[PDB]
Amino acid sequence: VELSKKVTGKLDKTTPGIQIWRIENMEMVPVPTKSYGNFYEGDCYVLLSTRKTGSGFSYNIHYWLGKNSSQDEQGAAAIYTTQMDEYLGSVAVQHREVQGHESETFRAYFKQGLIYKQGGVASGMK
């Protein structure tokens, strides 16, 4: 929870790849490359692509909103993307995505196949 500090304070600064953040349990977590191939569908996943250039790296902070989390959850993943946008150095960008908006855009950053499991991993609700 709160990627900032343990995340926004050290995102991608020298590595070609994209990192996401699982908004499971209605919160957030640093999704590494060992699990960026299957993200629940009914949730939110903040992404952060980083490419190289003739000067530095071009970051891209996206916010996936698998229409399932509560309204605030949509403001939690999108807000985390707004905090890493200025913390990255203003070099990152902002993008919008959803369970029906991350079509070729999300798959675009993922050259393989994206999966979508269930949401609410607390199994303690209804």
Your description of this structure?
Strands 2-1-3-4-5 form a 5-stranded mixed beta sheet, with helices on both faces. The chain has a single domain, classed as Severin. Helices cover 22% and strands 24% of the residues. Strand 4 (57-65), helix 2 and strand 5 (94-98) form a beta-alpha-beta unit. The chain has helices spanning 3-6, 71-87, 103-109, and strands at residues 17-22, 30-31, 45-52, 57-65, 94-98. The protein is globular, with a radius of gyration of 14 Å. The chain is an alpha+beta fold. The chain is built from 3 helices and 5 strands. The longest helix is centred in the middle third of the chain and has 17 residues, at 71-87.
Descriptors for this entry?
monomer, 126 residues, alpha+beta, Severin, five-stranded mixed β-sheet, 5 strands, Villin-1
Based on secondary structure, the structural category is alpha+beta
- Put simply, the count of helices is 3
What portion of the residues fall into strands of 2 or more residues? 15-25%
CATH homologous superfamily?
A: Severin
Largest sheet: 5 strands, mixed
Order of helices and strands: HEEEEHEH
What fold name stands as the CATH topology?
Severin
Number of domains: 1
Shape assignment = globular
Organism: Gallus gallus (Chicken)
Subcellular location: Cytoplasm, Cytoskeleton; Cell projection, Microvillus; Cell projection, Lamellipodium; Cell projection, Ruffle
Family: Belongs to the villin/gelsolin family.
Subunit structure: Monomer. Homodimer. Associates with F-actin; the association with F-actin is inhibited by tropomyosin.
